[PDB]
Design a protein around this ligand. Structure first.
Ligand SMILES: *[C@@H]1O[C@H](CO)[C@@H](O[C@@H]2O[C@H](CO)[C@@H](O)[C@H](O)[C@H]2NC(C)=O)[C@H](O)[C@H]1NC(C)=O
Ligand SMILES: *[C@@H]1O[C@H](CO)[C@@H](O[C@@H]2O[C@H](CO)[C@@H](O)[C@H](O)[C@H]2NC(C)=O)[C@H](O)[C@H]1NC(C)=O
Ligand SMILES: *[C@@H]1O[C@H](CO)[C@@H](O)[C@H](O)[C@H]1NC(C)=O
Lengths: 35, 50
């Protein structure tokens, strides 16, 4: 359960839905960097 | 073996639960830091030329 007193953390917490266990912010950073 | 980061531990976070230490432990940890290197000086005409 993630009821942090009303503080929403889904943006930075890891998201298990995607195959890679990375947060939406981390995934945005990864896609924004081209190797 | 594949690298293992550490022991997976889960904290019983709740909306009314607090953990407070009843004791402590005076931990003394050592920390090493280099400060200076060996002081050297050369001379070409004797190094470069015999
Ligand atoms: C935390 O924020 C995320 C978005 O940053 C919320 O996810 C959105 O939820 C709305 C429903 O209100 C949907 O319409 C959006 O499509 C969702 N976006 C994403 C990226 O999932 C989430 O519901 C919020 N959770 C809490 C508990 O506040
Ligand atoms: C806090 O921890 C210390 C040890 O880290 C406890 O002191 C020990 O107490 C036991 C008795 O239960 C003795 O057998 C040990 O020899 C003690 N150790 C030392 C280093 O003195 C101390 O009792 C703990 N605090 C409380 C309130 O129990
Ligand atoms: C503590 O946890 C839940 C998390 O959603 C919180 O909403 C509620 O106040 C507490 N639990 C219940 C069901 O009372």
């Amino acid at each position: 359960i993630k009821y942090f007193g009303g503080f929403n953390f889904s943006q930075i917490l890891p998201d298990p839905s995607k195959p890679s266990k990375r947060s939406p912010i981390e995934d945005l950073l990864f896609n924004k960097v081209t190797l | 073996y594949t690298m293992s980061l550490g022991a997976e531990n889960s904290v019983a976070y709740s909306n009314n639960s607090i953990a407070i230490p009843t004791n402590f432990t005076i931990s003394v940890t050592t920390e090493i830091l280099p400060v200076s290197m060996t002081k050297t000086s050369v001379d070409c005409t004797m190094y470069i030329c015999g």
